[PDB]
RNA sequence: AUACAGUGAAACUGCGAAUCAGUUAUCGUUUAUUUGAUAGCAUGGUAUAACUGUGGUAAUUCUAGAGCUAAUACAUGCUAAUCUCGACCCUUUGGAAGAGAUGUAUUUAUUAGAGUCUUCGGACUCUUUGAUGAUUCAUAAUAACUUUUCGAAUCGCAUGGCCUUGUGCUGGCGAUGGUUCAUUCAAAUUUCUGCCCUAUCAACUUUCGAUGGUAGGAUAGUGGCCUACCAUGGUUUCAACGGG
């Protein structure tokens, strides 16, 4: 796709030279916001836009990198992961079944599968409630 | 009122501006000397 | 939040606004002129705003023609015409060239008048031209 | 006298001591006298006077010079106080241009509402001179780059009229008609540099048409001749010499820009006068441009080599020998590439030209290039 | 606007009234810098109370590292010198065995320079390079071989640099913080992670290594040549039991 | 001390007026103050305070009237001048005719910001920039927009020098101000855990925002903090939701 909205989607200020000839018309902007990853081929030769993504959008990653299992993908560009971590209680002195909800903005770099494990880090706050961003599934 | 002191202070402001510039743009050149030394080194 | 601004066209009149932590912001109202820029070889000029044709979120602004960010324009073409025929020696892209004797150009606003108080246009050229003519076809 | 001027500006009984009114308007006095006298002349009526035409003429000259704000506003009030028929449709433009809120697009728009009457031309030229009198440090720059670019929306006759208006105070054709100029005034010499800056500004704003006016071009030549006159009339206390070096560099770079920008329908058949002035500029040291940034000397020589018409006034003097000498210096700078391109352009535009003088210049150029183009060791750009 | 939760290396008792001196804004952080009031009143006892501390500051008398700075709560902290013309003294004030601020007594030719770990380096404006060290000495025009976590020798009379010091294996380092505070030595190995928790590791006579984060430590110098005379005879703080054992031996 | 010179009431100006707990990031914000760097007209006008007076009013720290006069209060406003290439000389460590170059604040568009040869000593050319883990980072150039920002109309102590004794030109210490950057001190948000009892609380949130994505507005900014447009989500027997 190229549009889903009345407005236009475009990488801001990374434009081509609109006089001379190049076979891209927009230099798709490379970035990596850290964490030692190699840049993805979908970002080098991709087609989406995603201003909340950490590979073309202008948001940065650092801080709290955590993991979990994907259970919910039904929203728009944001998936909910399951940090299924066991807790401890001073009453029982045993272990118990616990998990919390963590939503994370999915990126269309690689596909959005229901069930995989992701490695997501703390970003500048993309929305009202979601705080992290997908850097790698 | 124009005093002997007021144009003295105006003269001192002139002297301070010209002295600050005549130190700054020369310290630029003494930095460029070390940069030229390292450029001949590498 | 604070009050809306909804700045219009003609008769430049700007509120003086001090905000949180210095940062003097220019709440411009009723913008009359605009600095625009050739996006492929870089010449800018103050240029007289005529009207706003497109709004990318609400056709209330296509009705009332309120100046904001990201609203496609048709503005003046005459100072770009005078430079285009006064320094060239030619006195003339092809679909940009088609917008010469129509008396109107096409561009877009990025600077917020309720925040910065400026008025910026970049002359769209290429796939911007193609998508925005398709948006003119989407309206019409 | 300041109390007398204030009392005569308060008690408004005009046409009672109006005997030396136009003589005082044509005479000189201080600025504290000039402001009160212009306030009195704006408080009067000027319909029937000793000479109402002379009063309007002094008002136009005051709004021309004006020191860019105050007498401009006072003379605009005087011009509205005169017989201002067909000007109430431009009184808003006059008040805006005299005011410090002179949005130049707004002034040229209110005059474009007052257009098809042509009764705003003298006021617009005086407003252009007022906006051109801005002086020094980046506010004057932001105003001057606005003014010289915004005055391009005007008539094709009125642009040459404003150029002649700049020409008027420092034309000096009666001074330079006999041999050259002999009187040196630094205050008028600075106005020559102001005319040079305004002409370069107008040429850079509109470098296709450029609007040639012949007396203005000859006055620019007279200013360059006064620069060479001061250089031969060295004033070695040398504030005048520094001013003359500031005038001649910008003057040569401006005179090269007019020819090299118009180059088709300008530079009329009287090119021998400009060739004589260039011969006077080369007779000091023809090879004084051996640098790579050789400004306007190599540009005029290369433009005369490029445009095939100018070879006649080129070969009038021996100037191709001068360009070949500056090219054939031993340790010549990176302008040697422009000199070789000049040899390429002057081979098929002088050796394919009229045989009497242009082929003679081409023969001299080929004789220079046979025994003087030996060290071809340009080890830089292979292009 | 108040205090008494002061950093306990200030030798501050509890029954000295309630409030402690709040360090005003200056070169250093509050947690690792002592003010001139807690110096001149209850660190070397040249004064008795704040009134006469104000007297001996506005007597044009004190000169923290080249200049007067009449301010009681002035945070002259680590690696500075405090000269006084009367009492002949110069105090480079550094860390020590236990963690508090040891005074020195420094002569003039060692008192006419300090040194500074660089905190960051950039290009300031108009092409000019840009160096700032730990006390806010934003200094233009270094030598171009600039690293970060790196020691520059500040001339301290005129505020330029007089000498440059790199950092690698086999040249001294001195810790400012952590549990191992005020300790020297640099000879094990130069390990680096990413994301911190790395140190230039620390020698001992028994090869005892102390590894902290690299923001705390910085170079003094090299073997045989440190640029500061060191407190209490090069204090490495072996042991109280080893001290009593050496007491029983010799 | 015939401008002023000591103290100096009054007044203006300047400055200052569920605690949640541990807990990371601010490459998402501003950063007053301190501290350190940092910017080539013998000096003009308001519009007034204290005060002098006229009163009202039971009265208030109530006041109106007119006469006054101050600025670091308000509002305007300025001086060629230096760095490159320097052919030639006369030897230079120069002085030179002149071909030249010229700040800052806001906004947008960019663009850059990636194996021989030997005087065995020496040379013979090799690559442009500051980094973090990471950038549209730091920084430089053009184009104009600026309801046009700043680039000192300020003060205290001495007041020394150059000699062409002008009444010239210079010159010290430091008080305030002021552009930008950094520091320091802060704020305002943000990542991870927790506390009162409950299934005689099992469903809770898209009522008139619920939860996302796209644009716009608000923002000091990341950000439904809101607007429209696209999607119909999200939470939960894990003790959620509600109540004590």
JSON list of N, CA and C in Angstrom, two decimals, chain C residues 26-59:
[
{"chain": "C", "resi": 26, "resn": "UNK", "atom": "N", "xyz": [4.86, 32.85, 18.29]},
{"chain": "C", "resi": 26, "resn": "UNK", "atom": "CA", "xyz": [4.16, 33.89, 17.53]},
{"chain": "C", "resi": 26, "resn": "UNK", "atom": "C", "xyz": [2.81, 33.32, 17.11]},
{"chain": "C", "resi": 27, "resn": "UNK", "atom": "N", "xyz": [1.75, 33.65, 17.85]},
{"chain": "C", "resi": 27, "resn": "UNK", "atom": "CA", "xyz": [0.40, 33.25, 17.46]},
{"chain": "C", "resi": 27, "resn": "UNK", "atom": "C", "xyz": [-0.07, 34.20, 16.36]},
{"chain": "C", "resi": 28, "resn": "UNK", "atom": "N", "xyz": [0.32, 33.88, 15.14]},
{"chain": "C", "resi": 28, "resn": "UNK", "atom": "CA", "xyz": [-0.10, 34.68, 14.00]},
{"chain": "C", "resi": 28, "resn": "UNK", "atom": "C", "xyz": [-1.55, 34.39, 13.66]},
{"chain": "C", "resi": 29, "resn": "UNK", "atom": "N", "xyz": [-2.29, 35.45, 13.39]},
{"chain": "C", "resi": 29, "resn": "UNK", "atom": "CA", "xyz": [-3.64, 35.32, 12.88]},
{"chain": "C", "resi": 29, "resn": "UNK", "atom": "C", "xyz": [-3.75, 36.05, 11.55]},
{"chain": "C", "resi": 30, "resn": "UNK", "atom": "N", "xyz": [-4.54, 35.45, 10.65]},
{"chain": "C", "resi": 30, "resn": "UNK", "atom": "CA", "xyz": [-4.97, 36.07, 9.40]},
{"chain": "C", "resi": 30, "resn": "UNK", "atom": "C", "xyz": [-3.79, 36.41, 8.49]},
{"chain": "C", "resi": 31, "resn": "UNK", "atom": "N", "xyz": [-3.07, 35.36, 8.07]},
{"chain": "C", "resi": 31, "resn": "UNK", "atom": "CA", "xyz": [-1.85, 35.51, 7.29]},
{"chain": "C", "resi": 31, "resn": "UNK", "atom": "C", "xyz": [-2.17, 36.07, 5.92]},
{"chain": "C", "resi": 32, "resn": "UNK", "atom": "N", "xyz": [-1.36, 37.01, 5.45]},
{"chain": "C", "resi": 32, "resn": "UNK", "atom": "CA", "xyz": [-1.57, 37.63, 4.15]},
{"chain": "C", "resi": 32, "resn": "UNK", "atom": "C", "xyz": [-0.57, 37.20, 3.09]},
{"chain": "C", "resi": 33, "resn": "UNK", "atom": "N", "xyz": [0.72, 37.17, 3.42]},
{"chain": "C", "resi": 33, "resn": "UNK", "atom": "CA", "xyz": [1.77, 36.80, 2.48]},
{"chain": "C", "resi": 33, "resn": "UNK", "atom": "C", "xyz": [2.43, 35.50, 2.91]},
{"chain": "C", "resi": 34, "resn": "UNK", "atom": "N", "xyz": [3.25, 34.94, 2.02]},
{"chain": "C", "resi": 34, "resn": "UNK", "atom": "CA", "xyz": [3.91, 33.69, 2.34]},
{"chain": "C", "resi": 34, "resn": "UNK", "atom": "C", "xyz": [5.24, 33.47, 1.64]},
{"chain": "C", "resi": 35, "resn": "UNK", "atom": "N", "xyz": [6.25, 32.99, 2.36]},
{"chain": "C", "resi": 35, "resn": "UNK", "atom": "CA", "xyz": [7.53, 32.68, 1.76]},
{"chain": "C", "resi": 35, "resn": "UNK", "atom": "C", "xyz": [7.48, 31.26, 1.21]},
{"chain": "C", "resi": 36, "resn": "UNK", "atom": "N", "xyz": [7.70, 31.12, -0.09]},
{"chain": "C", "resi": 36, "resn": "UNK", "atom": "CA", "xyz": [7.66, 29.83, -0.76]},
{"chain": "C", "resi": 36, "resn": "UNK", "atom": "C", "xyz": [9.02, 29.55, -1.37]},
{"chain": "C", "resi": 37, "resn": "UNK", "atom": "N", "xyz": [9.24, 28.30, -1.78]},
{"chain": "C", "resi": 37, "resn": "UNK", "atom": "CA", "xyz": [10.56, 27.85, -2.18]},
{"chain": "C", "resi": 37, "resn": "UNK", "atom": "C", "xyz": [10.47, 26.80, -3.27]},
{"chain": "C", "resi": 38, "resn": "UNK", "atom": "N", "xyz": [11.29, 26.97, -4.30]},
{"chain": "C", "resi": 38, "resn": "UNK", "atom": "CA", "xyz": [11.45, 25.98, -5.35]},
{"chain": "C", "resi": 38, "resn": "UNK", "atom": "C", "xyz": [12.18, 24.77, -4.81]},
{"chain": "C", "resi": 39, "resn": "UNK", "atom": "N", "xyz": [11.52, 23.62, -4.82]},
{"chain": "C", "resi": 39, "resn": "UNK", "atom": "CA", "xyz": [12.00, 22.44, -4.12]},
{"chain": "C", "resi": 39, "resn": "UNK", "atom": "C", "xyz": [13.07, 21.66, -4.87]},
{"chain": "C", "resi": 40, "resn": "UNK", "atom": "N", "xyz": [13.38, 22.02, -6.11]},
{"chain": "C", "resi": 40, "resn": "UNK", "atom": "CA", "xyz": [14.35, 21.25, -6.88]},
{"chain": "C", "resi": 40, "resn": "UNK", "atom": "C", "xyz": [15.62, 22.01, -7.24]},
{"chain": "C", "resi": 41, "resn": "UNK", "atom": "N", "xyz": [15.64, 23.34, -7.12]},
{"chain": "C", "resi": 41, "resn": "UNK", "atom": "CA", "xyz": [16.89, 24.07, -7.30]},
{"chain": "C", "resi": 41, "resn": "UNK", "atom": "C", "xyz": [17.04, 25.25, -6.33]},
{"chain": "C", "resi": 42, "resn": "UNK", "atom": "N", "xyz": [16.11, 25.45, -5.41]},
{"chain": "C", "resi": 42, "resn": "UNK", "atom": "CA", "xyz": [16.36, 26.30, -4.27]},
{"chain": "C", "resi": 42, "resn": "UNK", "atom": "C", "xyz": [16.36, 27.80, -4.47]},
{"chain": "C", "resi": 43, "resn": "UNK", "atom": "N", "xyz": [15.20, 28.39, -4.75]},
{"chain": "C", "resi": 43, "resn": "UNK", "atom": "CA", "xyz": [15.02, 29.83, -4.68]},
{"chain": "C", "resi": 43, "resn": "UNK", "atom": "C", "xyz": [13.73, 30.10, -3.91]},
{"chain": "C", "resi": 44, "resn": "UNK", "atom": "N", "xyz": [13.79, 31.00, -2.94]},
{"chain": "C", "resi": 44, "resn": "UNK", "atom": "CA", "xyz": [12.64, 31.32, -2.10]},
{"chain": "C", "resi": 44, "resn": "UNK", "atom": "C", "xyz": [12.23, 32.77, -2.30]},
{"chain": "C", "resi": 45, "resn": "UNK", "atom": "N", "xyz": [10.94, 33.04, -2.10]},
{"chain": "C", "resi": 45, "resn": "UNK", "atom": "CA", "xyz": [10.41, 34.38, -2.29]},
{"chain": "C", "resi": 45, "resn": "UNK", "atom": "C", "xyz": [9.12, 34.56, -1.51]},
{"chain": "C", "resi": 46, "resn": "UNK", "atom": "N", "xyz": [8.94, 35.76, -0.95]},
{"chain": "C", "resi": 46, "resn": "UNK", "atom": "CA", "xyz": [7.68, 36.15, -0.35]},
{"chain": "C", "resi": 46, "resn": "UNK", "atom": "C", "xyz": [6.61, 36.28, -1.42]},
{"chain": "C", "resi": 47, "resn": "UNK", "atom": "N", "xyz": [5.43, 35.73, -1.16]},
{"chain": "C", "resi": 47, "resn": "UNK", "atom": "CA", "xyz": [4.44, 35.48, -2.20]},
{"chain": "C", "resi": 47, "resn": "UNK", "atom": "C", "xyz": [3.05, 35.59, -1.59]},
{"chain": "C", "resi": 48, "resn": "UNK", "atom": "N", "xyz": [2.12, 36.21, -2.32]},
{"chain": "C", "resi": 48, "resn": "UNK", "atom": "CA", "xyz": [0.83, 36.63, -1.77]},
{"chain": "C", "resi": 48, "resn": "UNK", "atom": "C", "xyz": [-0.20, 35.51, -1.82]},
{"chain": "C", "resi": 49, "resn": "UNK", "atom": "N", "xyz": [-0.69, 35.11, -0.65]},
{"chain": "C", "resi": 49, "resn": "UNK", "atom": "CA", "xyz": [-1.64, 34.00, -0.52]},
{"chain": "C", "resi": 49, "resn": "UNK", "atom": "C", "xyz": [-2.99, 34.39, -1.10]},
{"chain": "C", "resi": 50, "resn": "UNK", "atom": "N", "xyz": [-3.53, 33.52, -1.96]},
{"chain": "C", "resi": 50, "resn": "UNK", "atom": "CA", "xyz": [-4.90, 33.66, -2.46]},
{"chain": "C", "resi": 50, "resn": "UNK", "atom": "C", "xyz": [-5.88, 32.82, -1.66]},
{"chain": "C", "resi": 51, "resn": "UNK", "atom": "N", "xyz": [-5.69, 31.50, -1.65]},
{"chain": "C", "resi": 51, "resn": "UNK", "atom": "CA", "xyz": [-6.66, 30.64, -1.01]},
{"chain": "C", "resi": 51, "resn": "UNK", "atom": "C", "xyz": [-6.11, 29.26, -0.71]},
{"chain": "C", "resi": 52, "resn": "UNK", "atom": "N", "xyz": [-6.90, 28.52, 0.06]},
{"chain": "C", "resi": 52, "resn": "UNK", "atom": "CA", "xyz": [-6.61, 27.15, 0.44]},
{"chain": "C", "resi": 52, "resn": "UNK", "atom": "C", "xyz": [-7.68, 26.25, -0.14]},
{"chain": "C", "resi": 53, "resn": "UNK", "atom": "N", "xyz": [-7.26, 25.21, -0.85]},
{"chain": "C", "resi": 53, "resn": "UNK", "atom": "CA", "xyz": [-8.18, 24.35, -1.58]},
{"chain": "C", "resi": 53, "resn": "UNK", "atom": "C", "xyz": [-8.38, 23.01, -0.89]},
{"chain": "C", "resi": 54, "resn": "UNK", "atom": "N", "xyz": [-7.37, 22.50, -0.20]},
{"chain": "C", "resi": 54, "resn": "UNK", "atom": "CA", "xyz": [-7.40, 21.15, 0.32]},
{"chain": "C", "resi": 54, "resn": "UNK", "atom": "C", "xyz": [-7.14, 21.12, 1.82]},
{"chain": "C", "resi": 55, "resn": "UNK", "atom": "N", "xyz": [-7.88, 20.25, 2.53]},
{"chain": "C", "resi": 55, "resn": "UNK", "atom": "CA", "xyz": [-7.66, 19.95, 3.93]},
{"chain": "C", "resi": 55, "resn": "UNK", "atom": "C", "xyz": [-7.56, 18.43, 4.05]},
{"chain": "C", "resi": 56, "resn": "UNK", "atom": "N", "xyz": [-6.51, 17.91, 4.69]},
{"chain": "C", "resi": 56, "resn": "UNK", "atom": "CA", "xyz": [-6.35, 16.46, 4.80]},
{"chain": "C", "resi": 56, "resn": "UNK", "atom": "C", "xyz": [-7.00, 15.82, 6.01]},
{"chain": "C", "resi": 57, "resn": "UNK", "atom": "N", "xyz": [-7.85, 16.53, 6.77]},
{"chain": "C", "resi": 57, "resn": "UNK", "atom": "CA", "xyz": [-8.58, 15.86, 7.85]},
{"chain": "C", "resi": 57, "resn": "UNK", "atom": "C", "xyz": [-10.04, 16.27, 7.99]},
{"chain": "C", "resi": 58, "resn": "UNK", "atom": "N", "xyz": [-10.48, 17.38, 7.40]},
{"chain": "C", "resi": 58, "resn": "UNK", "atom": "CA", "xyz": [-11.81, 17.92, 7.66]},
{"chain": "C", "resi": 58, "resn": "UNK", "atom": "C", "xyz": [-12.21, 18.90, 6.56]},
{"chain": "C", "resi": 59, "resn": "UNK", "atom": "N", "xyz": [-13.32, 18.64, 5.88]},
{"chain": "C", "resi": 59, "resn": "UNK", "atom": "CA", "xyz": [-13.75, 19.52, 4.80]},
{"chain": "C", "resi": 59, "resn": "UNK", "atom": "C", "xyz": [-14.42, 20.80, 5.30]}
]
